[PDB]
């Protein structure tokens, strides 16, 4: 038997529903999103880290000249300078006072510590959402993960559960994401091969053990002016350091909807945003014909000063007469109220307590026990605890946000105004009639 | 430190402790069931914009109720008097 309902996408919050196949005993259906994993389609652009500036041992032809060869090394800046006549500990290292040149080959290479301190730039084409649902149907329950992508059934075992397109296509990750040490930061890193000096990714590579690394450190070499052999390599401090200093707080502390961000793979998780369209074709073997279920022939609702609140602050009691004792479902027929329980063991005659929560200031929500209905009604007091460590379990429906007394007053004011304009119409009728009646 | 907590909930994380999440309850001064003296202040606290909107709605409705009904009644009174007010000897 196919059924469908929306579910608030809020981790751990247990949604409640009652499926009432016509000839069969209404079956309890509680939907719970035990976890979620909004994992987008990542693609690695490049890795980066603090470059290590390695100045290879300078080459001097002494009396002669040198060809400034090319190289594959990143930012090869093998400029050549003449008239150096350098000195080592053994004194001069050439045999002429001039007509000599110093070649100062220079590279940037991955620092050995980059092996761990590296960072990687990831693109994210789309954020498909996968939610780890725990679902209980009747006196049976299963855990199953499904892709909330849409048609994607992602069902498991006998429950052909199918999720629907997320009400909102929210994504926490910006289009360009960089990962570091398992921290995540959204940042428009420069494209591959588009390095800029001192910016993030001043050096980039396919991966840490690649020989195709490039860079644009802006390395420049001055003349070896001092007497001792030395190469004046100077450059912008690594853009990796500037980013490490200025990247600010990571995404793990900035993504909205409470998204929790993890790495390997990059994924958002336990993020509470929008609603999840859910439909489920629960198997008929889960139902029983109404005639074989316990049935109550008298029922009434009594509420013990429901404290409306984010948690189960309200309490109410059902008094009943039943035909047979047994275990029988219960549910709320109003989404403004949610019942902490879903099924109860019912005596032949008696009563049972049913904890509940509600965002409405009232209790004007119908309660059902195995197909019977009772209109609960009472004023619910606001909760003294301004703050609790539990997510608000129900949405604040405006249609039930007005208290009965307040709704009465508001409708009394509008009733007065409307009745006055109605009297206006009535007197215009009276005048129009009198004018012709007494002609 | 003071942090405004929305009904959606707020996460605060301190030093190295596990992130603690807390949610604001829809609870405020006054009472959704007292007289208006407490009703208006309660809803105003919960939603200033919505409460002011509803109050202006009531005021506008009252304005129509008063001035438009008074205009209609004045119209009928005026036009029912005038057939007599024009007659100096009519027995109303």
UniProtKB/Swiss-Prot annotation, chain A:
<protein>
    <recommendedName>
        <fullName>Spike glycoprotein E1</fullName>
    </recommendedName>
</protein>
<feature type="glycosylation site" description="N-linked (GlcNAc...) asparagine; by host">
    <location>
        <position position="270"/>
    </location>
</feature>
<feature type="disulfide bond">
    <location>
        <begin position="259"/>
        <end position="271"/>
    </location>
</feature>
<comment type="subunit">
    <text>Interacts with spike glycoprotein E2. The precursor of protein E3/E2 and E1 form a heterodimer shortly after synthesis. Processing of the precursor of protein E3/E2 into E2 and E3 results in a heterodimer of the spike glycoproteins E2 and E1. Spike at virion surface are constituted of three E2-E1 heterodimers. After target cell attachment and endocytosis, E1 change conformation to form homotrimers. Interacts with 6K protein.</text>
</comment>
<feature type="disulfide bond">
    <location>
        <begin position="49"/>
        <end position="114"/>
    </location>
</feature>
<feature type="glycosylation site" description="N-linked (GlcNAc...) asparagine; by host">
    <location>
        <position position="245"/>
    </location>
</feature>
<feature type="disulfide bond">
    <location>
        <begin position="301"/>
        <end position="376"/>
    </location>
</feature>
<feature type="glycosylation site" description="N-linked (GlcNAc...) asparagine; by host">
    <location>
        <position position="139"/>
    </location>
</feature>
<feature type="disulfide bond">
    <location>
        <begin position="68"/>
        <end position="78"/>
    </location>
</feature>
<feature type="region of interest" description="E1 fusion peptide loop">
    <location>
        <begin position="84"/>
        <end position="101"/>
    </location>
</feature>
<feature type="disulfide bond">
    <location>
        <begin position="306"/>
        <end position="380"/>
    </location>
</feature>
<feature type="topological domain" description="Cytoplasmic">
    <location>
        <begin position="430"/>
        <end position="439"/>
    </location>
</feature>
<comment type="function">
    <text>Class II viral fusion protein. Fusion activity is inactive as long as E1 is bound to E2 in mature virion. After virus attachment to target cell receptor PCDH10 and endocytosis, acidification of the endosome induce dissociation of E1/E2 heterodimer and concomitant trimerization of the E1 subunits. This E1 trimer is fusion active, and promotes release of viral nucleocapsid in cytoplasm after endosome and viral membrane fusion. Efficient fusion requires the presence of cholesterol and sphingolipid in the target membrane.</text>
</comment>
<feature type="disulfide bond">
    <location>
        <begin position="63"/>
        <end position="96"/>
    </location>
</feature>
<feature type="disulfide bond">
    <location>
        <begin position="328"/>
        <end position="370"/>
    </location>
</feature>
<feature type="topological domain" description="Extracellular">
    <location>
        <begin position="13"/>
        <end position="408"/>
    </location>
</feature>
<feature type="transmembrane region" description="Helical">
    <location>
        <begin position="409"/>
        <end position="429"/>
    </location>
</feature>
<feature type="disulfide bond">
    <location>
        <begin position="62"/>
        <end position="94"/>
    </location>
</feature>
């Amino acid at each position: 038997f196919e059924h469908a309902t929306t579910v608030p996408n809020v981790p751990g919050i247990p949604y409640k529903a009652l499926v009432e196949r016509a000839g069969y005993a209404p079956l309890n259906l509680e939907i719970t999103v035990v976890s979620s994993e909004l994992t987008p389609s990542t693609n690695k652009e490049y890795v980066t880290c603090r470059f290590h500036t390695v100045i290879p041992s300078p080459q001097v032809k002494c009396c002669g000249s040198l060809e400034c060869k090319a190289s594959s090394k990143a930012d090869y800046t093998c400029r050549v300078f003449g008239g150096v006549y350098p000195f080592m500990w053994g004194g001069a290292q050439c045999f002429c006072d001039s007509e000599n040149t110093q070649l100062s080959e220079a590279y940037v290479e991955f620092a050995p510590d980059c092996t761990i301190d590296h960072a990687v730039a990831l693109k994210v084409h789309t954020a498909a959402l996968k939610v780890g649902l725990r679902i209980v149907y009747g006196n049976t329950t299963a855990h199953l993960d499904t892709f909330v992508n849409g048609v994607t059934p992602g069902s498991s075992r006998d429950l052909k559960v199918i999720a629907g397109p997320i009400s909102a296509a929210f994504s926490p990750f910006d289009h360009k994401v960089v990962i570091r040490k398992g921290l995540v930061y959204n940042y428009d890193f420069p494209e591959y091969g588009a390095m800029k000096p001192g910016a993030f990714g001043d050096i980039q590579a396919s991966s840490l053990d690649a020989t195709d690394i490039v860079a644009r450190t802006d390395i420049r070499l001055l003349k070896p002016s001092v007497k001792n052999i030395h190469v004046p390599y100077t450059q912008a401090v690594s853009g990796y350091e500037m980013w490490k200093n200025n990247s600010g707080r990571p995404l793990q502390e900035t993504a909205p909807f409470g998204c929790k961000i993890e790495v390997e793979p990059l994924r958002a998780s336990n993020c509470a945003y929008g609603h999840i369209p859910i439909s489920i074709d629960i198997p008929d073997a889960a139902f029983v014909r109404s005639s074989e279920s316990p049935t109550i022939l008298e029922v009434s609702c009594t509420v013990a000063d429901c404290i409306y609140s984010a948690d189960f602050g309200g309490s109410l009691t059902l008094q009943y007469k039943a035909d047979r004792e047994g275990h029988c479902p219960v549910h709320s027929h109003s989404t403004t109220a949610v019942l902490k329980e879903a099924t109860t063991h019912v005596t032949a005659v008696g009563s049972i307590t049913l904890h509940f929560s509600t965002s409405s200031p009232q209790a004007n929500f119908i309660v059902s026990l195995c197909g019977k209905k009772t209109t609960c009604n009472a004023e619910c007091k606001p909760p003294a605890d301004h703050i609790i460590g539990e997510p608000h379990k129900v949405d604040q429906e405006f249609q039930a946000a007005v208290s009965k007394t307040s709704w009465n007053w508001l409708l009394a004011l509008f009733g007065g105004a409307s009745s006055l304009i109605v009297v206006g119409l009535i007197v215009l009728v009276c005048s129009s009639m009198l004018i012709n009646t007494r002609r | 430190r003071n942090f405004s907590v929305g009904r959606e909930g707020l996460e605060y994380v301190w030093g190295n402790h596990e992130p603690v999440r807390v949610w604001a309850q829809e609870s405020a001064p006054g009472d959704p069931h007292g007289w208006p003296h407490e009703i208006i202040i309660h809803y105003y606290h919960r939603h200033p914009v919505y409460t002011v909107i509803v109050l202006c709605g009531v005021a506008l409705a009252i304005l129509v109720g008063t001035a438009s009904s008074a205009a209609c009644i004045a119209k009928a009174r005026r036009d029912c008097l005038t057939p007599y007010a024009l007659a100096p000897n009519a027995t109303v």
